Ligand binder design. Structure first.
Ligand code: SF4
Ligand SMILES: [Mg+2]
Ligand SMILES: [Mg+2]
Ligand SMILES: [Mg+2]
Ligand SMILES: [Mg+2]
Ligand SMILES: [Mg+2]
Ligand SMILES: [Mg+2]
Ligand SMILES: [Mg+2]
Ligand SMILES: [Mg+2]
Ligand SMILES: [Mg+2]
Ligand SMILES: [Mg+2]
Ligand SMILES: [Mg+2]
Ligand SMILES: [Mg+2]
Ligand SMILES: [Mg+2]
Ligand SMILES: [Mg+2]
Ligand SMILES: [Mg+2]
Ligand SMILES: [Mg+2]
Ligand SMILES: [Mg+2]
Ligand SMILES: [Mg+2]
Ligand SMILES: [Mg+2]
Ligand SMILES: [Mg+2]
Ligand SMILES: [Mg+2]
Ligand SMILES: [Mg+2]
Ligand SMILES: [Mg+2]
Ligand SMILES: [Mg+2]
Ligand SMILES: [Mg+2]
Ligand SMILES: [Mg+2]
Ligand SMILES: [Mg+2]
Ligand SMILES: [Mg+2]
Lengths: 208, 151, 125, 84, 84
RNA sequence: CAAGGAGGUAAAAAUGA
RNA sequence: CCGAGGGUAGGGCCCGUGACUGGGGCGAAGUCGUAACAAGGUAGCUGUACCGGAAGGUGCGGCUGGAUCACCUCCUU
RNA sequence: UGAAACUCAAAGGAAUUGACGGGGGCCCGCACAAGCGGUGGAGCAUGUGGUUUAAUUCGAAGCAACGCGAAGAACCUUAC
RNA sequence: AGCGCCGGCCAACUCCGUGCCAGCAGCCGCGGUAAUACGGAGGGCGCGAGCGUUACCCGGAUUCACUGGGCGUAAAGGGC
């Protein structure tokens, strides 16, 4: 399946915090405040200047591990976006953001995208009244993503909803914390989300 | 203010009785990513001197780049010796599709998306001069009618 | 040339030729060894490279390299011929895949053992 | 095949013991391969010219050479030290 | 003269080399006394009979001895270890 | 003052680790 | 009558193989000489002919992918 | 007219900096020529090679190693 | 949870063993005492119910050039 294992090593290697765990990320035990250098025995050796291939590889790997996705689904979304009207990179992020597990993370039903993926897979997440237990379901505008009526009284689900009580969601989303529901209003444009990836370098990475 | 990127640093050799007596050459390119790019070639007995000499020559040798929203206005193809370069304008969202040397020149000039191709000899020195004279030959619709006015 | 000259004679296409005729358009081919020995390399190299003359299925009798450290091959050994040239040895245009019919895998190897045909060792892991 | 040691050879063979033993093991490795195929094998066997003419040389190290000669039944060693 | 080793000769001379330190150089000063005084000297010089037609022997340890025969300018070594 | 076209040539001496 | 096929005789093309023999390439610092690169010690190369262990040498003609970079022999102050 | 097997990781063109020439122009040094005294021949000293030896400790190897490390080997030195 | 790789192309470095041996190999090439190139280990990179290898096709190959090549000396002007 997807990547299972140490996750701080991924952010430490890319040199940027990718926020892949949740509260441990905004903690001082985050380990990018502790050790902001690549992992391994040669971490505190001095950075040899990366090639043009290393630059493109690093930013592609960074964007891929932010969403925690495999590399054929990543590249299938990529040519799905390229054989598509509009700007290839901005479309790409719009199809990546349309994933059900990502909409669950963004709505604050989860602390992490991996927790979001588990909650969707376990049927705690319902889309437009019916169950969708597949974390790759492309959510289209106007869909109401909610929580199952069997899973409404869950200690983890409520604590994350009461933690999301007061914080704002993105302009392409709506959230009803009291109803345990949200709506995919529109596709996110590229000014709406400002992840630390230069979308142009991953376009010209896959352009071999 | 000016981002300067080194591209080719080689070691040459000069024979005299006793052995080789070496010298290093550095080709650098400078830019502001807003329509201005320059390239220099400095040779000194060691590389930090070489890249400093090359940067000094690079800011002397600079060019106008008439960017249009993300790219070049028309496609241009110039032959410099046996080295030849293709530039083709691309729609917004394709990226700098170029090799090693026109990529470093065009993205420091500010190009978002472009289509290139290196033909003939692919020596980094003469391809770089070919791209620079190709960037020098780019005309807009303003310059076109200002020359075809007759006045 | 001129356009009329290309109408008349036209252009020649590349005519690619195979580096592996003994396999006869097959990925692998079974063969029985006939001579198993050690040969020595070419221009700037020195060793005792282990090869075997194999008379195989397509009626060809070729020489093939035995990769790895140590082998169990003799004059009546059944082997599979993989394909691939050895730069330092003349006439050796093929390889012997290990972990097959009578060519056992290399013992005590643990790094890249999909090549050289070695099983997965389990020392409580 | 018989082994014949000269005194120049034997003093240098016993000079290699007491000083650098990996060299006596290389010498033993070259003699063991020379014992089966005398003009083929390890240590780059090439025929010598201009003064050693009629002798063969196997390189022990990048400097040192094993100069030998061979008959139908014997193997005489001329040197096992230096560059000829 | 010169040293001549048989095939068992050197291989078991190589056995003592891979096995023990005092054996091989004790062996070698016997070789050194044997080249100067071929029939007399250190470690039991004796011509023997009925097994040996004109061949000689010398001591290392009473379990292992040193069998050899000497000609014009030659020193052949027949054995490096024990009797029979 | 200044040059070009024309023409008579060293010997006997080989090798490279 | 035609007719599958079988039999006899004679040809054409292709393939495997053969005592021996001819050159090629590889392993190659074996032996012999010094042909070419410096006027490479006879400028070199070439077509052709003859000869010679061998590179090669020579005859005739051709080419510059060589040479008027010093005294001195034929014609000018 | 005109291939193939096989083999090689190059084969090449112009140009650069050197080095070399039994190529040239100009010019030096006891380099030659002019001149004096020598070595190689004898005897002995000292160093080296070789050989011998228990051991003849080790190094230096064309110029630019060879009375050179020794501007002091009877036991000391001294490593054999 | 496995597989390939960590000299350069090509993302990823240290120690030990070995020592022109054993071996690697697509090219350049590496190995004759500290080998980031062999073998192992630690660590790392790339993918992941897969990962590598071989065989074949297209690409890179504007090295058959219509788009899109050349012919004084690099292969190439027919002797006229
Ligand atoms: S931000 Fe989160 S995933 Fe990144 S290093 Fe910190 S704790 Fe780990
Ligand atoms: Mg052109
Ligand atoms: Mg080698
Ligand atoms: Mg002569
Ligand atoms: Mg018939
Ligand atoms: Mg000559
Ligand atoms: Mg003549
Ligand atoms: Mg000549
Ligand atoms: Mg002729
Ligand atoms: Mg004649
Ligand atoms: Mg003539
Ligand atoms: Mg003519
Ligand atoms: Mg013919
Ligand atoms: Mg004089
Ligand atoms: Mg005298
Ligand atoms: Mg003294
Ligand atoms: Mg790298
Ligand atoms: Mg390997
Ligand atoms: Mg080591
Ligand atoms: Mg490798
Ligand atoms: Mg799958
Ligand atoms: Mg292949
Ligand atoms: Mg094509
Ligand atoms: Mg054309
Ligand atoms: Mg061409
Ligand atoms: Mg030519
Ligand atoms: Mg030509
Ligand atoms: Mg003509
Ligand atoms: Mg004709």
């Amino acid at each position: 399946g997807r990547y299972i294992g140490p996750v701080c090593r991924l952010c430490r290697r890319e040199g940027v915090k990718l926020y892949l765990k949740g509260e441990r990320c905004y903690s001082p035990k985050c380990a990018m405040e502790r050790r902001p250098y690549p992992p391994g025995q040669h971490g505190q050796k001095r950075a040899r200047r990366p090639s043009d291939y290393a630059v493109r590889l690093r930013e592609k790997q960074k964007l891929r591990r932010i969403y925690g996705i495999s590399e054929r689904q990543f590249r299938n979304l990529f040519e799905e976006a390229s054989k598509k009207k509009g700007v290839t990179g901005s479309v790409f992020l719009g199809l990546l953001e349309s994933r059900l597990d990502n909409v669950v993370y963004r709505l604050g039903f989860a602390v992490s995208r991996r927790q979001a993926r588990q909650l969707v897979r376990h049927g705690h997440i319902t889309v437009n009244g019916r169950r969708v237990d597949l974390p790759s379901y492309r959510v289209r505008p106007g869909d109401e993503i909610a929580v199952a009526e069997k899973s409404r009284n869950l200690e983890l689900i409520r604590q994350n909803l009461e933690a999301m009580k007061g914080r704002k969601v993105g302009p392409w989303l709506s959230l009803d914390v009291e109803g345990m529901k949200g709506k995919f209003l529109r596709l996110p444009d590229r000014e709406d989300l400002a992840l630390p990836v230069n979308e142009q370098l991953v376009i010209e990475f896959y352009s071999r | 203010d000016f981002e300067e990127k080194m591209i080719l640093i080689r070691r040459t050799a000069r024979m005299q009785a006793g052995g080789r007596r070496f010298r290093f050459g550095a080709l650098v390119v400078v830019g502001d990513r807003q329509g201005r790019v320059g390239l220099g070639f400095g040779k000194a007995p060691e590389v930090p001197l070489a890249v400093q000499k090359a940067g000094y020559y690079a800011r002397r040798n600079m060019v106008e780049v008439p960017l249009q929203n993300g790219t070049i206005p028309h496609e241009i193809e110039v032959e410099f010796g046996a080295s030849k370069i293709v530039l083709k304008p691309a729609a917004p969202g394709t990226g700098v599709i170029a090799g090693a040397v026109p990529r470093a020149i065009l993205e420091l000039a500010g190009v978002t998306d472009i289509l290139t191709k290196e033909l003939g000899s692919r020596n980094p020195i003469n391809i770089a001069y070919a791209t620079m004279e190709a960037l020098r030959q780019l005309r807009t619709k303003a310059d076109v009618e200002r020359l075809r006015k007759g006045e | 040339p001129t356009i009329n000259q290309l109408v008349r004679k036209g252009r020649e296409k590349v005519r690619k030729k195979s580096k592996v005729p003994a396999l006869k358009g097959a990925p692998f081919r079974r063969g029985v060894c006939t001579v198993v020995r050690t040969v020595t390399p070419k221009k700037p190299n020195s060793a005792l490279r282990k090869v075997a003359k194999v008379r195989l299925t397509s009626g060809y009798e070729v020489t093939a390299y035995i990769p790895g450290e140590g082998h169990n091959l003799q004059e009546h050994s059944v082997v599979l011929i993989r394909g691939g040239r050895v730069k330092d040895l003349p006439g050796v245009r093929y390889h012997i895949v290990r972990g097959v019919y009578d060519a056992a895998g290399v013992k005590d190897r643990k790094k890249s053992r999909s090549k050289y045909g070695t099983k997965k060792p389990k020392e409580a892991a | 095949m018989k082994l014949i040691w000269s005194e120049e050879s034997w003093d240098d063979y016993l000079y290699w013991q007491e000083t650098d033993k990996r060299i006596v093991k290389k010498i033993n490795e070259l003699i063991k391969d020379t014992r089966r195929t005398p003009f083929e094998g390890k240590g780059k066997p090439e025929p010598l010219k201009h003064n050693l003419s009629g002798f063969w040389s196997r390189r022990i190290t990048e400097e040192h050479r094993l100069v030998y000669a061979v008959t139908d039944d014997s193997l005489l060693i001329a040197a096992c030290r230096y560059h000829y």
